[PDB]
Design a binder for this molecule. Sequence first.
Ligand SMILES: CCCCCCCCCCO[C@@H]1O[C@H](CO)[C@@H](O[C@H]2O[C@H](CO)[C@@H](O)[C@H](O)[C@H]2O)[C@H](O)[C@H]1O
Ligand SMILES: CCCCCCCCCCO[C@@H]1O[C@H](CO)[C@@H](O[C@H]2O[C@H](CO)[C@@H](O)[C@H](O)[C@H]2O)[C@H](O)[C@H]1O
Ligand SMILES: CCCCCCCCCCO[C@@H]1O[C@H](CO)[C@@H](O[C@H]2O[C@H](CO)[C@@H](O)[C@H](O)[C@H]2O)[C@H](O)[C@H]1O
Ligand SMILES: [Br-]
Ligand SMILES: [Br-]
Ligand SMILES: [F-]
Ligand code: NA
Lengths: 125, 125, 96, 96
Amino acid sequence: MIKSLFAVIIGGSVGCTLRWLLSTKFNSLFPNLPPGTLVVNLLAGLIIGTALAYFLRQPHLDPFWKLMITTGLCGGLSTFTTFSVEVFALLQAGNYIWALTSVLVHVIGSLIMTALGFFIITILF
Amino acid sequence: IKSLFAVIIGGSVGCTLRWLLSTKFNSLFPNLPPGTLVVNLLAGLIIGTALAYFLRQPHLDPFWKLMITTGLCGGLSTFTTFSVEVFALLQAGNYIWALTSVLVHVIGSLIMTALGFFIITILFA
Amino acid sequence: SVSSVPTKLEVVAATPTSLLISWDAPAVTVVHYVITYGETGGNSPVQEFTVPGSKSTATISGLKPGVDYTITVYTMYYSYSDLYSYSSPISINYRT
Amino acid sequence: SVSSVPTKLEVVAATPTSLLISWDAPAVTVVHYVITYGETGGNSPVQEFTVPGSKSTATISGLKPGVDYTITVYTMYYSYSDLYSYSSPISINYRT
Ligand SMILES: CCCCCCCCCCO[C@@H]1O[C@H](CO)[C@@H](O[C@H]2O[C@H](CO)[C@@H](O)[C@H](O)[C@H]2O)[C@H](O)[C@H]1O
Ligand SMILES: CCCCCCCCCCO[C@@H]1O[C@H](CO)[C@@H](O[C@H]2O[C@H](CO)[C@@H](O)[C@H](O)[C@H]2O)[C@H](O)[C@H]1O
Ligand SMILES: CCCCCCCCCCO[C@@H]1O[C@H](CO)[C@@H](O[C@H]2O[C@H](CO)[C@@H](O)[C@H](O)[C@H]2O)[C@H](O)[C@H]1O
Ligand SMILES: [Br-]
Ligand SMILES: [Br-]
Ligand SMILES: [F-]
Ligand code: NA
């Protein structure tokens, strides 16, 4: 399990770090829907969509890479909590229109970015 | 660079905790994997308590805040795994549990953030 | 740890040119089922088709009377560890 | 590096014992604003109350006529890097 653990941590660290750099640079530009935390969910949602289709077509890939890419990169790149507090803070500011908007865009947007990365690779192959 | 370490150290812990929890438990109820739910409910609790608590201690080392939030909560929580499960349910035609999974993850994590918040909030009062 | 192969694949009704098969879904998010069938005598093109993850029965049609068919069902299933992947088949033989 | 401090804090309407202040919101997600007011003259107690983050005006009441007050506004805002923290104050003087 130690080799697995290294994949989680390496992929995660690359993910967490990327989310951090993107968030501090871009979030404050549109507080009603902080775009840094959106893009890292739209991005990792895209990545996991491609992984969905590619892993399927590559039954023999080393799991170390699959774990590092999904639980690691995508698990560390995406966030449910930062998305959560922003909505929570919007709610407490009484900015309900943007709290609700924030939820729809993140949820429906991730799925789309997933379906995107999935149906791109499908069609490629 | 010292911030980098907090994200990594925290994220690694959060990612590692997400990995162990989901493998052990997701398979027990695939219509709404409970490992991925719990990490998101639990990080939400942490970020709610961290919300109320850090507000009241504006002298605390930002290192510790970043480790707990962008790091641990960022690593522990996951959006792609929640999204992937939904997508899988959606492709499988299991709309009702795709919908449920979204409500339970979003409504559930907001309720958990509010508890963590208001527990600390009510504690100090 | 949880098996992604269907169980209890069986012909539940037959005519001489068609079979209604059914199976028990495994304990995983099955995205869709694949049904394969061909003549057991190593000399017919195996055909595969899909049925949605919610169904557990399928109709195999256009068959020859009195012939031995091998019929298998496997899943394209989602799991945490593997994302999407194909399961091992469950297979039966049936004479029309 | 986006300011959480409000700007253009001003009195827009006054009675001898009340003030109506308005400010421009900082370009961040303010949860609530804190308003504080005391007599500019020395050791009078300063008083405060909150106003919700949507509002950007606040009435101050129960003042003494022809007295100089120091009015101060700052925010409890959500930012990504700080979570819930407080802006620095913006401050004006005004005589009833
Ligand atoms: C569907 C999923 C639900 C999951 C759980 C969501 C939890 C939401 C927490 C909201 O927090 C409250 O929000 C009020 C409204 O924003 C604030 O009222 C403040 O702001 C109001 C609106 O401007 C004023 O009317 C109030 O008097 C003032 O106290 C109040 O302080 C705050 O504690
Ligand atoms: C809230 C929106 C979020 C963003 C969009 C997410 C999209 C997720 C579903 C897309 O995948 C498709 O889902 C269909 C429905 O599950 C499947 O239909 C399959 O299953 C159906 C089940 O009724 C059959 O009728 C179809 O013929 C059969 O192709 C189809 O294969 C599959 O590729
Ligand atoms: C699914 C559950 C959804 C509902 C969640 C709870 C919403 C209602 C909260 C009731 O208690 C609130 O407590 C706040 C304090 O915690 C008070 O805020 C007062 O103090 C706050 C700071 O503590 C300020 O932000 C507010 O603007 C100010 O009105 C507020 O008056 C009071 O009503
Ligand atoms: Br966070
Ligand atoms: Br994942
Ligand atoms: F995502
Ligand atoms: Na995460």
